[PDB]
Amino acid sequence: EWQGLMQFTLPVRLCKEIELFHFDIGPFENMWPGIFVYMVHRSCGTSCFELEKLCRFIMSVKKNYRRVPYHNWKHAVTVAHCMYAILQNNHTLFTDLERKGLLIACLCHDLDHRGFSNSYLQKFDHPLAALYSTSTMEQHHFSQTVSILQLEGHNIFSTLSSSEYEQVLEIIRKAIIATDLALYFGNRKQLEEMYQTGSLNLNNQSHRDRVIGLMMTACDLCSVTKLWPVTKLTANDIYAEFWAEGDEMKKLGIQPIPMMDRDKKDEVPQGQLGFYNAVAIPCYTTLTQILPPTEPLLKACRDNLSQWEKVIRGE
Ligand SMILES: COc1cn(-c2ccc3c(c2F)C(C)(C)C(=O)N3CC2CC2)nc(-c2ccnn2-c2ccccc2)c1=O
Ligand SMILES: [Mg+2]
Ligand SMILES: [Zn+2]
């Protein structure tokens, strides 16, 4: 499988489309691994990784996403593509090591997801929660990333120096942990404060980490930034996963919270409106403030919000 990837060439008709924030990978499943190779090559250079190691790595990542309704291989590549578009539109700001780390972090950020929230795992004293008390799944995702990197023929970072290697692994660690949405709220609030007091300073590593964390959230949530038919379908996948978790609670006779209850289906449009207003709009607003070229994400998020309003109002 990995050898045929080495030969892959992105069809020329997709060379312009892939640069756009709203690009939907949906119709191109057999190309997803090749699309990631393409994005790495354009963003980090063709001399960045040894091609064979990169190809082995990508295929091992793919195999370590489970067949769940939403946190699957499709989501991994979708998030990686959003990061690509952010990086391509902010060419001066990030280092070569950051561009490498962040594309890899995005592809890996939900590795071996089981379709359960951290809350679920903690409540039922699952072994992963016994191991990782906070940001439970995210620590697991990073752990899985490191395990794949340490496989024979998979160390894509083998040709970095000792210091550069630990640096990129820390970029990846922080970026994956930042995808714990519980951490986003505080991160965005701190960034908003720093922005408006004019103290935000990208020479400051801790400020940089915060900006990278917000970029990670923005990429992770980017299904809300696609054209309406794409966004609407992805919402189906998201709730399928919410409801499957709810169903697991019902197996103990336990009534789940509304968001995870398939019997509360009629409340979905209102639920989405609430989520866009409370989470997605603030995310892309703050991101656009810090990185003006990301504005198309906010524009697309606003468009989908108005679509959900129309659904609620029966228009
Ligand atoms: C209602 O509709 C939606 C609700 N959520 C949502 C999710 C988790 C949590 C919450 C949410 F709102 C709250 C309630 C804030 C919460 O505490 N968690 C758990 C998390 C803190 C640790 N996400 C999406 C969405 C749109 C795009 N990607 N995702 C997404 C889907 C699954 C997981 C994460 C994000 C969505 O569409
Ligand atoms: Mg996650
Ligand atoms: Zn994710």
Which residue has a Cα nearest atom 35 of ligand 1? 221
Q: Which tokens belong to 255?
A: 């009534």
Phi-psi region of 45 (alpha: psi -120 to 50; beta: other; left: phi over 0): left
Q: Quick check: 208 and 202 in contact, CB under 8 A?
A: yes
Q: In a 10 Å sphere around its CB, with 0-12 CB exposed, 13-18 middle and 19+ buried, how is residue 183 labelled? A: middle
Solved how? X-ray
Q: How far is CA 274 from CA 12, 92, 205, 277, in A?
A: 40, 36, 34, 5
Q: How far is CA 260 from CA 67, 141, 252, in A?
A: 19, 23, 15
3-class state of residue 156 by DSSP: coil
Q: Which tokens belong to 126?
A: 């699952």
Using alpha carbons, select from 291, 116, 138 the residue that is nearest to residue 210: 291
Mutate to test the pocket of ligand 1, among 122, 275, 284 (most ligand atoms within 8 A of CB): 275
Q: Quick check: 121 and 128 in contact, CB under 8 A?
A: yes
Measured distance CA(87)–CA(94) in Å, rounded: 8
Measured distance CA(86)–CA(21) in Å, rounded: 8
Residues with CB under 5 A from ligand 2 (ion): 110, 179
CB atoms within 10 A of CB 246: 23
Interior angle at CA 280, CA 279 and CA 286, nearest 5: 95
Measured distance CA(273)–CA(269) in Å, rounded: 6
Task: Please report, in angstroms and rounded to a whole number, the separation of the first and last CA atoms in the chain.
Answer: 47
Q: How far does Cα 123 stand from its chain's mean position?
A: 25
Q: Give the single-character DSSP code of 255.
A: P
Q: How far does Cα 204 stand from its chain's mean position?
A: 24
72 lines ligand 1 (CB under 6 A): no
The residues spanned by each domain of the chain are 1-315
User: 96-108 and 136-149 helices cross at what angle (nearest 10)?
Assistant: 110
Measured distance CA(223)–CA(218) in Å, rounded: 10
Q: Quick check: 33 and 62 in contact, CB under 8 A?
A: yes
Q: Quick check: 245 and 251 in contact, CB under 8 A?
A: no
Measured distance CA(192)–CA(187) in Å, rounded: 9
Tell me, in angstroms, the distance from the centre of ligand 1 to residue 81's CA: 20
3-class state of residue 290 by DSSP: helix
Dihedral angle over CA of 280, 281, 283, 284, nearest 10: 110
Which residue has a Cα nearest atom 27 of ligand 1? 221
Measured distance CA(98)–CA(189) in Å, rounded: 23
Write out the catalytic residue numbers: 71
259 lines ligand 1 (CB under 6 A): yes
288 lines ligand 1 (CB under 6 A): no
* Alpha helices per DSSP H over the chain: 2-7, 32-44, 51-63, 73-88, 96-108, 118-123, 127-131, 136-149, 162-178, 181-196, 205-220, 228-250, 268-275, 281-290, 295-313
Q: Quick check: 32 and 60 in contact, CB under 8 A?
A: no
Tell me, in angstroms, the distance from the centre of ligand 3 to residue 128's CA: 18
Q: Quick check: 114 and 45 in contact, CB under 8 A?
A: no
Which residue has a Cα nearest atom 17 of ligand 1? 182
Measured distance CA(23)–CA(300) in Å, rounded: 11
Q: How far does Cα 174 stand from its chain's mean position?
A: 13
Tell me, in angstroms, the distance from the centre of ligand 2 to residue 68's CA: 13
Residues with CB under 5 A from ligand 3 (ion): 110, 220
Q: Quick check: 315 and 291 in contact, CB under 8 A?
A: no
Measured distance CA(196)–CA(180) in Å, rounded: 25
State the ligand closest to the CA atom of 71: 3
3-class state of residue 115 by DSSP: coil
Measured distance CA(190)–CA(3) in Å, rounded: 46
Q: How far is CA 29 from CA 32, 42, 165, in A?
A: 5, 20, 32
**For residue 241, which atom of ligand 1 is closest to its CA?**
32
Using alpha carbons, select from 83, 110, 104 the residue that is nearest to residue 215: 83
Measured distance CA(128)–CA(125) in Å, rounded: 8
Please compute Rg for the chain using Cα positions.
Answer: 19
Measured distance CA(297)–CA(14) in Å, rounded: 20
Measured distance CA(115)–CA(72) in Å, rounded: 9
Superfamily of domain 1-315: 3'5'-cyclic nucleotide phosphodiesterase, catalytic domain (1.10.1300.10)
* Amino acid in position 140: H
297 lines ligand 1 (CB under 6 A): no
Measured distance CA(160)–CA(101) in Å, rounded: 12
Q: Quick check: 151 and 60 in contact, CB under 8 A?
A: yes
Q: In a 10 Å sphere around its CB, with 0-12 CB exposed, 13-18 middle and 19+ buried, how is residue 216 labelled? A: buried
**Resolution of the solved structure (Å):** 1.8
